[PDB]
Design an enzyme around this catalytic site. Sequence first.
Site, PDB file in Angstrom:
ATOM      1  N   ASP B  79      18.534 -29.081  68.142  1.00 30.49           N
ATOM      2  CA  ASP B  79      17.215 -29.253  67.447  1.00 30.49           C
ATOM      3  C   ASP B  79      17.203 -28.648  66.054  1.00 30.49           C
ATOM      4  O   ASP B  79      17.796 -27.599  65.856  1.00 30.49           O
ATOM      5  CB  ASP B  79      16.098 -28.533  68.224  1.00 30.49           C
ATOM      6  CG  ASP B  79      15.931 -28.998  69.651  1.00 30.49           C
ATOM      7  OD1 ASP B  79      16.825 -29.574  70.269  1.00 30.49           O
ATOM      8  OD2 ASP B  79      14.813 -28.756  70.170  1.00 30.49           O
ATOM      9  N   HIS B  81      13.902 -29.163  63.987  1.00 30.94           N
ATOM     10  CA  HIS B  81      12.475 -28.808  63.898  1.00 30.94           C
ATOM     11  C   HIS B  81      12.038 -28.408  62.484  1.00 30.94           C
ATOM     12  O   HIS B  81      11.332 -27.387  62.275  1.00 30.94           O
ATOM     13  CB  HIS B  81      12.092 -27.695  64.921  1.00 30.94           C
ATOM     14  CG  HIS B  81      11.968 -28.224  66.321  1.00 30.94           C
ATOM     15  ND1 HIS B  81      11.137 -29.291  66.631  1.00 30.94           N
ATOM     16  CD2 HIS B  81      12.556 -27.854  67.486  1.00 30.94           C
ATOM     17  CE1 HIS B  81      11.212 -29.547  67.932  1.00 30.94           C
ATOM     18  NE2 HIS B  81      12.075 -28.691  68.473  1.00 30.94           N
ATOM     19  N   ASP B 107      14.867 -34.104  67.683  1.00 28.04           N
ATOM     20  CA  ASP B 107      13.915 -33.019  67.312  1.00 28.04           C
ATOM     21  C   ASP B 107      14.202 -32.570  65.902  1.00 28.04           C
ATOM     22  O   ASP B 107      14.455 -31.374  65.619  1.00 28.04           O
ATOM     23  CB  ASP B 107      13.964 -31.826  68.320  1.00 28.04           C
ATOM     24  CG  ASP B 107      13.130 -32.119  69.584  1.00 28.04           C
ATOM     25  OD1 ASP B 107      12.656 -33.279  69.748  1.00 28.04           O
ATOM     26  OD2 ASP B 107      12.905 -31.180  70.373  1.00 28.04           O
ATOM     27  N   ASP B 110       8.501 -31.351  63.413  1.00 28.43           N
ATOM     28  CA  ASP B 110       7.473 -30.479  63.999  1.00 28.43           C
ATOM     29  C   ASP B 110       7.898 -29.011  63.928  1.00 28.43           C
ATOM     30  O   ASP B 110       9.089 -28.687  63.975  1.00 28.43           O
ATOM     31  CB  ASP B 110       7.090 -30.819  65.482  1.00 28.43           C
ATOM     32  CG  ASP B 110       6.257 -32.093  65.607  1.00 28.43           C
ATOM     33  OD1 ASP B 110       5.463 -32.333  64.677  1.00 28.43           O
ATOM     34  OD2 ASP B 110       6.393 -32.799  66.641  1.00 28.43           O
ATOM     35  N   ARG B 111       6.869 -28.176  63.817  1.00 27.74           N
ATOM     36  CA  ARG B 111       6.891 -26.705  63.827  1.00 27.74           C
ATOM     37  C   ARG B 111       7.328 -26.224  62.443  1.00 27.74           C
ATOM     38  O   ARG B 111       6.561 -25.577  61.770  1.00 27.74           O
ATOM     39  CB  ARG B 111       7.808 -26.104  64.886  1.00 27.74           C
ATOM     40  CG  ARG B 111       7.705 -26.773  66.294  1.00 27.74           C
ATOM     41  CD  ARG B 111       6.309 -27.019  66.721  1.00 27.74           C
ATOM     42  NE  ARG B 111       5.552 -25.813  67.034  1.00 27.74           N
ATOM     43  CZ  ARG B 111       5.604 -25.138  68.185  1.00 27.74           C
ATOM     44  NH1 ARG B 111       6.441 -25.535  69.162  1.00 27.74           N
ATOM     45  NH2 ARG B 111       4.846 -24.046  68.319  1.00 27.74           N
ATOM     46  N   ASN B 139      12.437 -35.688  71.945  1.00 22.82           N
ATOM     47  CA  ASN B 139      11.081 -35.912  72.457  1.00 22.82           C
ATOM     48  C   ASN B 139      10.042 -35.777  71.330  1.00 22.82           C
ATOM     49  O   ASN B 139       8.927 -36.357  71.456  1.00 22.82           O
ATOM     50  CB  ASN B 139      10.728 -34.972  73.640  1.00 22.82           C
ATOM     51  CG  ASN B 139      10.868 -33.481  73.332  1.00 22.82           C
ATOM     52  OD1 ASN B 139      11.850 -33.062  72.811  1.00 22.82           O
ATOM     53  ND2 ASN B 139       9.843 -32.665  73.686  1.00 22.82           N
ATOM     54  N   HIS B 140      10.366 -35.048  70.242  1.00 18.45           N
ATOM     55  CA  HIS B 140       9.378 -34.941  69.126  1.00 18.45           C
ATOM     56  C   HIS B 140       9.333 -36.143  68.227  1.00 18.45           C
ATOM     57  O   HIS B 140       8.385 -36.263  67.428  1.00 18.45           O
ATOM     58  CB  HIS B 140       9.625 -33.681  68.242  1.00 18.45           C
ATOM     59  CG  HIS B 140       9.121 -32.440  68.911  1.00 18.45           C
ATOM     60  ND1 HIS B 140       7.938 -31.839  68.537  1.00 18.45           N
ATOM     61  CD2 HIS B 140       9.564 -31.775  70.009  1.00 18.45           C
ATOM     62  CE1 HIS B 140       7.696 -30.811  69.337  1.00 18.45           C
ATOM     63  NE2 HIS B 140       8.677 -30.740  70.242  1.00 18.45           N
ATOM     64  N   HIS B 188      19.228 -35.946  74.254  1.00 20.34           N
ATOM     65  CA  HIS B 188      18.438 -34.803  73.841  1.00 20.34           C
ATOM     66  C   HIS B 188      18.053 -33.908  75.042  1.00 20.34           C
ATOM     67  O   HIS B 188      18.101 -32.663  74.958  1.00 20.34           O
ATOM     68  CB  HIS B 188      17.120 -35.274  73.173  1.00 20.34           C
ATOM     69  CG  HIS B 188      16.252 -34.131  72.746  1.00 20.34           C
ATOM     70  ND1 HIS B 188      16.593 -33.302  71.699  1.00 20.34           N
ATOM     71  CD2 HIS B 188      15.059 -33.680  73.210  1.00 20.34           C
ATOM     72  CE1 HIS B 188      15.684 -32.357  71.564  1.00 20.34           C
ATOM     73  NE2 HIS B 188      14.729 -32.570  72.466  1.00 20.34           N
ATOM     74  N   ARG B 243       7.420 -28.454  81.528  1.00 22.63           N
ATOM     75  CA  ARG B 243       7.082 -29.470  80.545  1.00 22.63           C
ATOM     76  C   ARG B 243       5.801 -30.205  80.907  1.00 22.63           C
ATOM     77  O   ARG B 243       5.203 -30.793  80.031  1.00 22.63           O
ATOM     78  CB  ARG B 243       8.178 -30.499  80.408  1.00 22.63           C
ATOM     79  CG  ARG B 243       9.591 -29.935  80.088  1.00 22.63           C
ATOM     80  CD  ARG B 243       9.682 -29.406  78.708  1.00 22.63           C
ATOM     81  NE  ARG B 243      11.061 -28.959  78.451  1.00 22.63           N
ATOM     82  CZ  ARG B 243      11.441 -28.464  77.275  1.00 22.63           C
ATOM     83  NH1 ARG B 243      10.536 -28.371  76.296  1.00 22.63           N
ATOM     84  NH2 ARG B 243      12.695 -28.058  77.077  1.00 22.63           N
ATOM     85  N   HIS B 270      17.235 -29.389  73.268  1.00 19.81           N
ATOM     86  CA  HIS B 270      15.865 -29.378  73.842  1.00 19.81           C
ATOM     87  C   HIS B 270      15.396 -27.987  74.344  1.00 19.81           C
ATOM     88  O   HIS B 270      14.183 -27.799  74.494  1.00 19.81           O
ATOM     89  CB  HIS B 270      15.821 -30.473  74.973  1.00 19.81           C
ATOM     90  CG  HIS B 270      14.500 -30.750  75.628  1.00 19.81           C
ATOM     91  ND1 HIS B 270      13.311 -30.944  74.950  1.00 19.81           N
ATOM     92  CD2 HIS B 270      14.209 -30.962  76.951  1.00 19.81           C
ATOM     93  CE1 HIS B 270      12.357 -31.303  75.802  1.00 19.81           C
ATOM     94  NE2 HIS B 270      12.865 -31.282  77.038  1.00 19.81           N
TER      95      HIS B 270
END
Lengths: 119, 359, 171
Positions: B79, B81, B107, B110-111, B139-140, B188, B243, B270
């Site tokens: 990831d 991010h 991923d 995000d964040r 998943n993001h 992922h 999750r 992940h």
Amino acid sequence: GVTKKILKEGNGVDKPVKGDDIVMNYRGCLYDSSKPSEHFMGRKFDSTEERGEFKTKIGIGVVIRGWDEAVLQMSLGEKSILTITDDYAYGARGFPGLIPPHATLVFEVELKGINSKRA
Amino acid sequence: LERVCKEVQAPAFHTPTNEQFWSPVDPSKPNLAFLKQHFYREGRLTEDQALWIIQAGTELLRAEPNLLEMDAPITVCGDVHGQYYDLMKLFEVGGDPAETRYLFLGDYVDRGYFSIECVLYLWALKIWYPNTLWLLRGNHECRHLTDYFTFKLECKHKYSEKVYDACMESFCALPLAAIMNKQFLCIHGGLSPELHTLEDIKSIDRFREPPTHGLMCDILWADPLEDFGTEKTGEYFVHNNVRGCSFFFSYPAACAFLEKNNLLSIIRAHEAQDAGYRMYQKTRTTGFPSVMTIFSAPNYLDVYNNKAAVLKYENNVMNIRQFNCTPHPYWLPNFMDVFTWSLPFVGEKITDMLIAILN
Amino acid sequence: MSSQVLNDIVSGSNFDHEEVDRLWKRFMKLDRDKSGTIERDEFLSLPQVSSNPLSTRMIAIFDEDGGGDVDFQEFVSGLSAFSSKGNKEEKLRFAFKVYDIDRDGFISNGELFIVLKMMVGSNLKDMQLQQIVDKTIMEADLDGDGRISFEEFTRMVENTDVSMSMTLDQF
Ligand SMILES: C=CC[C@@H]1/C=C(\C)C[C@H](C)C[C@H](OC)[C@H]2O[C@@](O)(C(=O)C(=O)N3CCCC[C@H]3C(=O)O[C@H](/C(C)=C/[C@@H]3CC[C@@H](O)[C@H](OC)C3)[C@H](C)[C@@H](O)CC1=O)[C@H](C)C[C@@H]2OC
Ligand SMILES: [Ca+2]
Ligand SMILES: [Ca+2]
Ligand SMILES: [Ca+2]
Ligand SMILES: [Ca+2]
Ligand SMILES: [Fe+3]
Ligand SMILES: [Zn+2]
């Protein structure tokens, strides 16, 4: 208006009073009812992790009411959850771009310092 | 003053001209060196420049199969991010993509508040190196999570909803898995009660938002059990209550899959790791770790002070390369400007003094 | 030392004659040495003033001509923007003036850093504050001169109720 759930007690002796400088770590989240066990903490809107410790005079009204009342009831080193309803935070107006109208806030807080004292 | 902190580097205040944007070496592609330093300086593209990159990447991605197949040597990455300043370090330690094969497990966004720089630069690299750099879906990379977290807001702040929408369509084109060196399933998330053979991945219609249930969900969302390798119950899959969707999968589930499909290990991402990676219980059959987690976002969220790592696989050696976080510029929460931020307090301070004067 | 026409101070402000009469009484309370002007020390001798991070900004804004003290006309004009009878623009103008230290009609990079640092102290490291100042200017500076005009400022704060911030209920 505000409730304070203690996660780790502080030293049980040094407590902020009106006019003291305090030093605090915090994470502030929007209230989310679907998340008990995360203390109803939903999306984070701010935290000190990404910036540096937070400093303010306490009890003189320059922070939101829920902080100004709850912090006077902490001791040095205490880590707690503050749940603050909107009328003890940003009310109808909210904070443009960040806090919606009538938001309940949830803060995780840690009292790191009072004047010269450090936890 | 004109400026108070002269030692602080200012951002790139203007968008690139089209002359700057396009490469002098190959005028059908962007200037990578230029883009890399422009984003490092917190510079923006024009909307048309950003859309071009995203759309050109989409055309490449949508021609690729659901299940990629590529040989070693290769650098495998977990990831990111939105942590652009760590992505720069990732390439420093993983190898220049001009001469290095790459596989990212998703991923990207995000964040971190430099998600759109990560996407635009990785997509520019994909356009330059389409046959040596590959990008999977995490998943993001979907509407639901980017709306819930920060990427939608970041796109609307720095660019436009049109740029956000173009990213969402591009994310639907990202392949879901790879077989690396005929040896490793790279995904992922994790295994699935519906993942029996590799033909099951090929059958997926990937060009859509991930469903809340089903094989496509699980590939992006599933985790190994917390007691992976030391289980008591014999279950292959259990509902993933961490999750809130998909599954935890067991060591016996992983061994069964690997044996059935003649693979050595599952390489996935992940889950954050303090060490930047985690190797799970080796199989009996080959002695390779049945699962490897790789996680490439150091000091994740500015919180965890974890190392990141990449896997560099070459000459039959899995080299684990860890790295630490790199400082990055500060943003106010939600990209707020300093007037919006300060004016409420400014009002309180001023009126507090007027009150004192008048009363 | 001086004279003034009360009716002109009235018509030039948001206040009526009764309000200006009350304001004259408040001005005299501040004018401790009865000089007819408010000197810096006469503001700063109020604890609620000297402890306020914006005290030097408020004093400077009152001192319209920058001459070093505040006469009654300046006192009334400075307060007039806070009247509930005042309009949206003059409240935005007052807010702009908090940041525009040298009064030239533009907020520069350094002015914005200095005024924000007054309020934030060590809550931001200098590098952090400089970075978000730089990006605010990058986003607000539509004509590209490196500084923020009144028009550019008003565009950035469209979604903030500056009027609510810049009003006093009772005078
Ligand atoms: C020049 C800069 C302004 C100056 C900013 C700083 C010193 C930086 C400091 C780290 C704040 C953060 O900056 C990233 C950011 O923290 C938040 O995210 C947040 O976690 C929060 O809720 N906090 C902060 C921690 C104490 C409780 C509460 C708060 O009381 O904060 C106070 C607050 C906003 C009070 C308002 C003032 C207006 C009144 O009308 C309103 O009345 C209802 C209450 C803050 C401490 C003010 O004393 C000081 C300032 O405002 C806010 C959601 C928005 C806020 O930025 C403004
Ligand atoms: Ca005097
Ligand atoms: Ca004067
Ligand atoms: Ca100026
Ligand atoms: Ca300008
Ligand atoms: Fe992730
Ligand atoms: Zn993930």
